[PDB]
Each structure stands twice: as structure tokens, then as C-alpha cells.
Amino acid sequence: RRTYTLADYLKNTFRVKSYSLRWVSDSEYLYKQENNILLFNAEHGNSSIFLENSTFEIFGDSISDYSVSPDRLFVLLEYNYVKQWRHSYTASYSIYDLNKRQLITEEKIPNNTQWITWSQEGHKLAYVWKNDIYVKIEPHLPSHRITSTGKENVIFNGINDWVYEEEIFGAYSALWWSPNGTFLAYAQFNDTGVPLIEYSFYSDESLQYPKTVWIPYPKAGAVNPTVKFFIVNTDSLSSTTTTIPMQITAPASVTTGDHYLCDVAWVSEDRISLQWLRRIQNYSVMAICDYDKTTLVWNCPTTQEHIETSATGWCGRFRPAEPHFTSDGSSFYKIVSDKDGYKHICQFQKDRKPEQVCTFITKGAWEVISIEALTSDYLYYISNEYKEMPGGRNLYKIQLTDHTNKKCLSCDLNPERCQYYSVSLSKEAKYYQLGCRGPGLPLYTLHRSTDQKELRVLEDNSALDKMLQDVQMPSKKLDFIVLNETRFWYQMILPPHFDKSKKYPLLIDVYAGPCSQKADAAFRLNWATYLASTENIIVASFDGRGSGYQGDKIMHAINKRLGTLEVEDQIEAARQFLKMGFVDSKRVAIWGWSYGGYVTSMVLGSGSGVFKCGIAVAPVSRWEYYDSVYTERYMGLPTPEDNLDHYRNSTVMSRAENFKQVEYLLIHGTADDNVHFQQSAQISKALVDAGVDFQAMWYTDEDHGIASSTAHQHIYSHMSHFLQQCFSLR
Amino acid sequence: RRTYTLADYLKNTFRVKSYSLRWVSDSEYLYKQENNILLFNAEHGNSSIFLENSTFEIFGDSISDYSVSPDRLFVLLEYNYVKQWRHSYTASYSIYDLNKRQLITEEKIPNNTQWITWSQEGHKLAYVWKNDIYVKIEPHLPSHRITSTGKENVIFNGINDWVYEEEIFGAYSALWWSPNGTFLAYAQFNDTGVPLIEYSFYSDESLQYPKTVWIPYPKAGAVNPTVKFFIVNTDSLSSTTTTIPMQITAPASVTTGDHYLCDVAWVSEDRISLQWLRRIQNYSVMAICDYDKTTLVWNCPTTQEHIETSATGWCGRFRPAEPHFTSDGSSFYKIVSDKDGYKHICQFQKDRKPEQVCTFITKGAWEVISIEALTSDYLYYISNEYKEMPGGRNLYKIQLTDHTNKKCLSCDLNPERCQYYSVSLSKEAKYYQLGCRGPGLPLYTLHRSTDQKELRVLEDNSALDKMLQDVQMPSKKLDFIVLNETRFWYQMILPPHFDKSKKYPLLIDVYAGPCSQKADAAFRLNWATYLASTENIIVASFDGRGSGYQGDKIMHAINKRLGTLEVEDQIEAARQFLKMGFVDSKRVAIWGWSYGGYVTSMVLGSGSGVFKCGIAVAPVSRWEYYDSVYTERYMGLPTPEDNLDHYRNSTVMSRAENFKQVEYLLIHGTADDNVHFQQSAQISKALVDAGVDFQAMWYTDEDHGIASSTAHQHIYSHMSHFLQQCFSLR
Numbered sequence A, B: 001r002r003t004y005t006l007a008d009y010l011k012n013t014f015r016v017k018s019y020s021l022r023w024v025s026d027s028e029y030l031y032k033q034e035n036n037i038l039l040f041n042a043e044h045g046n047s048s049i050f051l052e053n054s055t056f057e058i059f060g061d062s063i064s065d066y067s068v069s070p071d072r073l074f075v076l077l078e079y080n081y082v083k084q085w086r087h088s089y090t091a092s093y094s095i096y097d098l099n100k101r102q103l104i105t106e107e108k109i110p111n112n113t114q115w116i117t118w119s120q121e122g123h124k125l126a127y128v129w130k131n132d133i134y135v136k137i138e139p140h141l142p143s144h145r146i147t148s149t150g151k152e153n154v155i156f157n158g159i160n161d162w163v164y165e166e167e168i169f170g171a172y173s174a175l176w177w178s179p180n181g182t183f184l185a186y187a188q189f190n191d192t193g194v195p196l197i198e199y200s201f202y203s204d205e206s207l208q209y210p211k212t213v214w215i216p217y218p219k220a221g222a223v224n225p226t227v228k229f230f231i232v233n234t235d236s237l238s239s240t241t242t243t244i245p246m247q248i249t250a251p252a253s254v255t256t257g258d259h260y261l262c263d264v265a266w267v268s269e270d271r272i273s274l275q276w277l278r279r280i281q282n283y284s285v286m287a288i289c290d291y292d293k294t295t296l297v298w299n300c301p302t303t304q305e306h307i308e309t310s311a312t313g314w315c316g317r318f319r320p321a322e323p324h325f326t327s328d329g330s331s332f333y334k335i336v337s338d339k340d341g342y343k344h345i346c347q348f349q350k351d352r353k354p355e356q357v358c359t360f361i362t363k364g365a366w367e368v369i370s371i372e373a374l375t376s377d378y379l380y381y382i383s384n385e386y387k388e389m390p391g392g393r394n395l396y397k398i399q400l401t402d403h404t405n406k407k408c409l410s411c412d413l414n415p416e417r418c419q420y421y422s423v424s425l426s427k428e429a430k431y432y433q434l435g436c437r438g439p440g441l442p443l444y445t446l447h448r449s450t451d452q453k454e455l456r457v458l459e460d461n462s463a464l465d466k467m468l469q470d471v472q473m474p475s476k477k478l479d480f481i482v483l484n485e486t487r488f489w490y491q492m493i494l495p496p497h498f499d500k501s502k503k504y505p506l507l508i509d510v511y512a513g514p515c516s517q518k519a520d521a522a523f524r525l526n527w528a529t530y531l532a533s534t535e536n537i538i539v540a541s542f543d544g545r546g547s548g549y550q551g552d553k554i555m556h557a558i559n560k561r562l563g564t565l566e567v568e569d570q571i572e573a574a575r576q577f578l579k580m581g582f583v584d585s586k587r588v589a590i591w592g593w594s595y596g597g598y599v600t601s602m603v604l605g606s607g608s609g610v611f612k613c614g615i616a617v618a619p620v621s622r623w624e625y626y627d628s629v630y631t632e633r634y635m636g637l638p639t640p641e642d643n644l645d646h647y648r649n650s651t652v653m654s655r656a657e658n659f660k661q662v663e664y665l666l667i668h669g670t671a672d673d674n675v676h677f678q679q680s681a682q683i684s685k686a687l688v689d690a691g692v693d694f695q696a697m698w699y700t701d702e703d704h705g706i707a708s709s710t711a712h713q714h715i716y717s718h719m720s721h722f723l724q725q726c727f728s729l730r
């Protein structure tokens, strides 16, 4: 008879388990249990201690993470983790010799390492420190410095600069070991002409003069960082003081002007795959390069060029998808839009072929989310094909030799509980673990790839289940409304004993940025849960135009004009919800973070009358303020010769007036390096000039996620009270 | 039957007039009328056009101000005024030749001047541009560069650096022409070792990358700017390319360590008076320097040293009071604390006298506010002696030759309407205009100094009076409560038909910093007027310990320990008010700006339970954050060898916990160069860590005054709504 308290949320009272394993081979995997690394035999529960509760305590309680070498002979022990941006961070490392049973102490690894990683084979290491790349052929042996041009905020070697870490690659890493580890490829970035943004940092109240953090950040239209690609021969290191890395230069069709390095992928050990993108992500090229033994050089013949294009918008979802080559690297499968605009899988040949470079192996009004594994006979992927639910996820598999032999492997399993799967196949797809994130409580089970026999259940949240028993949890409808003759999905977090006859207050939850999906079949316990279980508020999300995985017609609809259709559709959806009866029209709100904050602001400032209040957290206020890679992908260049007009027309401050008819709460982090505060400061200024009262809240020294424990709790408490005041609850 | 709306305040509906004249001689004065400068004859209303409605319009509507040379031959026309700090600003100038009837156009004055001023005599001009001093013997003639060491944020010649402008002198100017204008003395400051503070400036939403403003600002304990005094011979200029200024060096008892230049005052044209203060304002020395014709050097013999001390606190109110020498500069009168701790006037001799340097000309438990004029037979001064009202201001006059012949010249006049006078005597005290700021509507009248005969009434706010007739204006009690057997004055802005039997909500208004006075007999039309007239809120102020002009016992009581007695006494006063009956104890609030924000915060966080809510605008949260000259004057150095403990003990963030029992609104300007935002940012962070919800509001690009039209209106509207919500009104 208890509800789900804001406190339950904030204090993480009801913990949701999972089973994050690490395949060490085609049949064994590692798993952390009570701070013990255990080696398990997929097949028979046969388990075994790999690393002890012990070991980790040597470096006390600061042991941030661990990395076992592929040959399972050593273990990287991470500690002194200091974050910096979304994925970047510096840490200290120790190499524990499993065999000799002790921490290697000789040629230690620098105490401020920016990035480290084993080879794909033995125990080779490559790490970046002070922006320079170093290599250790073996843990006991000394470092061999690979680059020396490294310099803070200027030259990045083997690590990404800010915009590259955030918008191109999903990480800080810009290193790629080859199979067999002969070569080590790496990217170099020059942030020279890139402008600087400089926010303040107050730190402890004991610091008398606040600090200034500067970051080379390219805002829409500004000069971007430049790239260069290199591959250095790792074997020679012992016979030289210095080795000379060979450089690969980007394809001709990309060098005429600004461009980006898209993706790196080793095919074999004498072949590497590189994807390049023009600054206007209209065009993209994937070059396949071969190593020349004779002239000791890498060649990227235009014959193996492969071009990807889009006359509707940009390439890929957030960039060209990644290639998956066969064993002999003669062919590769890659996800690309088909003639109808649906992201599907098609075969390619090393050599390009005059307007027939592809052969689609998938058709349909649905999309392949990702290619999970490629065997000598099978291609395992994940799609939202089943039951026509774009917000659902299932694991499929196609036999190469017979494309008709296509079978879903998760569809039967638990149709009720599981409609959103995550997969994880062993080194050669002999086994595969399934992660049911599905409607019901998450469920983890591993199967034998051959026949799909569910060997056992790794984790079923029974523990959580027994607890949620004494609690009145909300439900979640995931259906679709239909506009202009098209399906547009949405979801609702309905408070407990939801009575379709009564009238509840509505809270729209937004993102709605390009290729986003807020309406899906995944289980969650967030603030929306509390809002429904305790405040009896209906929290709904609506994937409109420019959204999710439903074809380019829907996703590209927003091209060159953000702050348009995706905002409208969001309002339209609220109307549609109202027509559904159980919504108290006099109590409808809308909130959002980042892009969601932008839309929230654009909606509240539309003077549509439909909304009473709204909260925008670290919103974007006009696109010239945001970075280049992201913004330009959808907006082009903010020049008069391109799209300056849509940039200036899609401003938040231009709608200040319409804010008089709305209660608004603007929140923003002081040390936000992604969305610069300048954006909110500009909004607030517009509102003050317009003579519009509103509420604001800054978070001292907080990130773009305002996720530090105390700040996190405070911001949701402050937002909860705002709604209670606005919905006349509390 | 109409109330005083918030709109009345914000739109300055009811304008209050005054009579700001400019004595051009001992019998005539200048006055601006409908943008026409008129010359009036004190005696007979005899008037006459000096400068027309015309002239000013040549420089359009950007004519910021005007300065008439003392020999009334030329007029300085200021325009293109661009503010910078409290008093600094740069403008463009034009010299209008009254006689030749047109704007001088030859050797024009640089388009970005930082400061200009006429000599005391003819038409000599001195101006600073690009941090360097220039002189023009006459308006048509060419500039003569006096310094060339000038450099932005490093070397200041003839103008004050940040701290000096804000805390030592009350302006930007550091130039001093001598009588007869032979010499030009100036100060030079080196901001070299002074640390930098760097806030962000966003500007129009069109600016893609925010700017950064850096200012050499010395926070408590930091390295301070250095000083140097020069006097240059203005007569030689035409016979050289460069003149060499002679330098005066501070007195020996001040040079051992950090010190400051206090005050400059020309005695005759061969004698100058300088005051110096040690960094620890415990000690001060006033040297009288004489010009040596033979060796062409200035001499400041220790025989004419004159020491000022304080074993209770610091020197003077905000620094040593200014000397006023006799015609032959043989003696001078200066306000200093007598044996009882009361600021009074006493006589001095050019030469110091072994512990008898002073002869007090005034006695009493009241203080002399200022020395207005010194005639060959009379000394006119302003005090709060009358009716024992420290919060009152009256013009007195003593006969040098006879210290008994002491007479008040304003006490009688309008005892009902006037209790707060401002004065303004002609070049030789033949006439004197009075500024009744008194209880009633401000009244301006001029008098023939001889017999006090009121020649006429210059301005009586009848226009205003006629208007306020149709409005329900609040009242204002100015009385005193008594604590620990001492009088402590307070004031109350009682709402219209205030009925002593009913119960109203209370709003404490605060500054309460060293030597402040919030309780006085001066008429005002502010936000407090609105609050009482329309919201029915009793706005009250209380001058507790560490306050006003009631002797050093009361003012120094706070020494070395701010955030103590002055905070408590404020709470005490609230209690006392409640005991007066007509206060609704369940609705007591307290707000303040600057130091007041600090106290407001220190009170709200005291957990005394006495207050419900409060507002702090640009508060100080811990003294290490504020500037040196101000902080140190009362707190000493933030070092373990001095007062570090009290600095650390008087923090606002240290009381975060107690804020859970209070609604708090923290407001702060983004471009605040006085109180750095770092201060509010540090407070918000403390409350977030403490798990205390509160309200905040930042003002983009706003000053420490948040005085820009739209901001000013927005901030008061926002605070009004805060109180309305808090007092359950609205």
C-alpha cells in the first residue's frame, strides 16, 4: 500500500540487477562477484576464481576498474580515476602478473595516463600520456615513445579532442591495434585554429580566486580541428631509438575542404578500413587500404573507395554505420538506407561496383539496429522488426549461404516480459547471453548458439520483484497514435490503479532530437516512476518527426530546419492525448534536458496555449551556440550562402513574449562544457528584456549532467516542487 | 483612494524634484532648466541664459554632461558616455568657446578619454587617455603628454585602479590641480602583482563566443597595487618636449610595508596635504609638504607629520577625514574621534605638537558629519546633534574667534518637514542653498549667509504634493528602542491607515555594515513604499552595533569580527518589534543587498526561528572573497598570524543546515565585478550539499547594481512575487 517515493528514486532503494560478463574466449567468460573476478564455463555453470576479493584492496578502495589481457596473463588495475568530459578521464595503473602472482613494479606506467589498452592478442600495451603515444611490448619491458608532438589543447595523439570525443567517436580513444598486433594505427588532431570557450570553476569554498577552464570548442560554422592518420610498425621498436609511422591520407574526394575521420576498422593485418566524412555530412567515403610489403607503405586505391550519400539529409543515424568484413576480408556487410529509406544490411565487395556496390540482405518497413556478429556462415543482428514495434529490440540471425534462412531468437522467449533485448555473443558465437531490458523486470539468460537451448538463467530480478510487491508501481502503455496517415509511437507511465475515467495531470517528457526514441519497450525506474506512483501524474513521451528508427522519411523530415516539425508534433501529441479523455487539460506540463530542454522552451514559447508550465534543463537556445559536428549535421553552415536563415529563425529568445502565458523553470550547470550556460544566460536575458517573470536555478560547478550526488538529488527535488506548485498538488 | 503600485515605483510615476545648482562665484550660480543652462543671481531672482536649449543638440541626444571652465570662458561637452565600474567611464569631448560662439575644432581631445577636468583657475585642462596624463594650457592649443608609462590593467596615471576607485577615493580621478594652477599633482598605481578575477560577458545573442573580462582585483590578503605621488610643473611645458615630474615619497612610518594613499588636498600653491594609511588601517599619517624654489623639490619634514591612530578599530569612518586649512594654511580643522570616541572637529597647527596636536572645537554625544566651509571667521559644518537624532542632519556654524558663538541654521526652518539637510555654500559662503531631504517632501531654499534671510524658495515639491494627494501613502516612524542600556535607532514604513491594534507582516531591510545608517529622517519613494502602501507590509530598518554616527564605541564594536553582533542585533530588533504588538510573528521576512545580503543570509541561517523567508542580492558569503581595502579595514589579514579564524568562522556556507527552516531567494548579477558571484555560487553549492531547497536567480550581464532598466524592473517584480508567495498574499 506504499507508493514509489521521490526518495526511493534519489536513494536508489529498489536496485535493478544485470549480468555484465566479459567473454574471454568462445566458451568462457569473466564475471565480477562480490568483488571477485570469476571465470565461468558457458555450458556447465562450472565456475572458478580468477582474481580475488583480495588484490583490489592493495590499491585500497580507489580501484576504479580492471582490464584482463587477452592472453589472460596480466591484469590492468585502474585507480585514481579523474573524470573529464563524457568519456575522457585520467587514471593511475598497475599491472598484476597472474602467473608470478604479484604486481609488476619495474617499468611502471605513468601516473596520469589518458588512455591505455591491450593489443587484441598477447600482452602488448599502448597508452597516451601528456598527449603522446607509448608502447610496451610486454608489461615488464620499458616504454617506447611513439609520438612527441603532443601538447595540451593543441595536438592530440591517439586520443580525441573535445568535439571528436563527443560527436564522432563515442570515446576518448583514437588508437587501434591490428589483429596479431604488428601495427598500431592512431589519429592525430590539431586544435590550432579552433576557438576557445572559457567557463569559471569555483571549487571548494577555500579557493580564494576561482579558476578558468578553457577548451578548444568549435561552435557551428567555426574552424574545426584537423586530422591525420598513422600506422606505426610495432615489431621494429626494439631495434631503433625511434620508429617512423607511415601516414594514410584521406581520399581525394574529401580533402578539398573541411572533413572528419568517421570510423577505423582493421580488416586483416595487412588491411584496414577507414571512413571519412565531409563537413557537410551529405557525402562519405569508406576507403579500404592495403599494406605494401615491398615499399613498406599503405595504399588506398580509389578502386576500393565506396561512396555513401544522402539527398534527403545526412549519412547514417549519427554517422556512417560500421563495416563488418568476412574472414578473408573479401566482402563486408554494412547497414545503409535502402531505396525506400530504411536502414538495412547489404553486402559489399572489397572493390566498388558502378552503382550496384550493394546487395541488400534485408528489406522491410523496419530497420536493423546493429550488426552483432559475423560468423563464417551466420550474421547476427538486432532489429525492431517484430510485431512492427520500432521501439522494440530483438536478436535475429541470417545464414550467409541462404538468406531465406532468417530466424528470430528472442521473439518467443518471453513475449510478455521481454520485447527489448541486448545481446552478447562469445568470441565465435558459440554461446550468447541475452539481456532482456523488455517491458518487465530485466532478465538475463545465456544460450548455446547451436540450437538456442537456454543453458540457464543468469539473472531474473526476483530480489527486486519481491520488493516491488509491497509497492504500487505505475504501468506503461506503449502504443501509437496516427497523424497525416503515419504511425507515430508514444508511451505513457500511468500512475497505479489508473482509472481511464478520471482526469490526471500530464507531463510531457522530451528529447525529440534527430534520430531519438523516447517511446520504447524498456523497463526503467526513474523520476517518471515517482511522478506517477506518488504524484499520480501521467508522464508521456512522443516520438514525432525527425525521430527514431522508422526510416529516413521520418528521420530526415527535420533536415535543415530544427525547431520546427519536431516541436509541433510534440504539441500535436499533447492534443491527441487530451482527446484520449483521461487528461485534465488544465494541468499539462512539459520538460526536457539538452535538446529536450530546447524543445520544451520552443513549445512553452509557441503560445499554443496547450501547456501551463515547463522545465528546460541545460537547453540549447540557438544553434550557433552548439558545437559543429552535431549542429551542422542537421543544420548545415550558419552562413547566408547556406542556412543562416533557419538558424536565426529557430531561436528560443525570439519567442520570449509568448512566455508570459507560462510558468517556466530554467536550470543550468555552471561548469557545463557541452551546452555552455551561455545558452541559458541568453534565454534569461531575452525574458528579462521582454518583461517576463520566470524561475531559474544554477548549479555551481556542475557538469552538463548535473550528476554529482548532491546536485542530482537537489535538482530533482527542486523540479518536483516546481510541478507540485504548478499542478496545485503539494 | 489609490495605493502606491509597484508600477508607480518601477515607472517612476511620481517624480521628486530638487535644485542642483552650480556656484560659479560667491554670488552667481548655474542651473539647468529645460536643457538650458541659466546663470542666476543669488540675492535677486535675476536670471540669464548661459547656454541654450541649442548647443547640446549639435552632439545630438548623446550629450551626457557639461563642465564650465572656472573663468566661464569655455564649456566641456561630454558625450558617448560608456560606464565602467562605479565611477569610471569613458567619453568624447568638445570644447565650446562661449565668447567666439562655436565649438573649438583644432587640437581636439581624444575620442576615448578616461577623465578630464579644468584647472581651478582659468581654462587649463588635464585629461587621462590610454592611462596617460595630458595637459592643454588653453583649449585651442595642443596637448602636452605628461606621462608615457600608462598601460591597461598595469600602470595607472592620474586615474585609480579598481580597488582605489571603489574603496579609497570615491571616483576615477587621481589628478589634483593646484590653486593658481602652476602644478598638477597626480597618483600612479602599479597593478603588477595584483591577482586577476575573470567573469564572462555574453553580450547580444548575436555574439557566438562569450567574452571574458579580467580585472586586477585584490581579495583580502592578496598583493595590493602600489602607489607613487608626483607633481609636475605646468608652466614649463612650452619650453620643453618633456617635463620631469618631481615625486613625493610617503612618510617613513608607512613605507616598511603595504600602505595606501588616503587623501590629497592643496593648501596653498606651495603647500600640499597628503594622507597615508598602513594596510592595517590601525595607523595613518598626514604629511604637509612645502615647495622648495631653490632646489625645485617638495619637502615633507617629519616636523609636519601629524599622526592619527585607533586602538579600538580603524581610522575615520571609511578613512581619515579631510583637512580644511586656513587661508594662510597655518592651521587646519579636521574631524577626528575625541577622547570619548565621538567624531568631532579640532584645530591643528602646520607643525605637530607632542600629544596635543589637537584642540577640539566641538564636544558631545553626537558627531560632526562633515565640514562644509571655512571662512576667515567662520566654520560651517553638518551634524546630527539636534534633538539627539543621529539619523538627522543639520547645518551649523561656529565663530573661529569665539567657539561659544555656535548656531544651528536649519533646526528652526521647518522642524515638521525638515530634519535632514544637505548644504551648498557659494564660493565664499556669502549665500548658501539648503537641501531639505527631511521627513516631508524635499524642500530647496537659498539664504543670504549674513543674517540667514531666506531670499527665496528654489523648489518645494508642490507638483509632487498635488499628486500624492490622490494616493494612500504610508508613514514612517523614526524612533529608538533601548538594549543593554543604549539607544539603538530604527525606522518603520507603516502602511496607510496603519492601525496599531491589527497585525501586519514584517520585512526587515538591511545593510548593517560598518558605519552604516538605515534609520534616518530622509524622505523616499522606493520599493518599500510600494510594499507598505499596496501589500500592507511593514518595512523596517534597524541600526545596531557596528553602525552609524553614534561614536566609536558603537561603530568599532564589530571590529575584527563581522557577521557577529550586527547580525544578532538585527534579530534582537525583530524580536523587539514583535513585542510592540502589531507584528504578525508568523510572517516576518528580511532582505538585503551587498553587505545586507550577507546579514540577511547570516540571519536566515542562524536558525533563530524568528524569520520565515528572506532575500539576499549579490551577497558576500565569506570575507576572503571580498576586496582588500574594505575587508581588511574591519577584518585585518586572513592569516593565522592575525584574524584567519574569524574569517573562517563568519562564513555563510557554514550555516547551510539552518536554511532548511527557511525559504530563501538568492539573486546575483552575472557581470558583478564588485561582489563576484563566486560568492553566491559558493553559497548555492553549500546548500545543495546540505540538501536544502531554495530559489535562485541570475541576471545575465548585469552589474553589482542590476540597475539596467529591464533588469531593475524584473528583479523587483521577482522579489515582490517571492514575498507575496511567502506571506500567503498574491
Ligand SMILES: CN1C(=O)c2[nH]c(N3CCC[C@H](N)C3)[n+](Cc3ccccc3C#N)c2C1=O
Residues within 6 Å of the ligand: A166, A167, A318, A510, A511, A513, A593, A594, A595, A596, A620, A626, A674, A675
Ligand atoms: C536529452 N538528450 C540526450 O539524452 C542526448 N544525447 C545526445 N547526443 C547523442 C549522440 C552523442 C552526442 N554527444 C550527444 N543528445 C544531443 C544533444 C542535442 C542538443 C544539445 C545537447 C545534446 C547533447 N548531449 C541528447 C539530448 O538532447
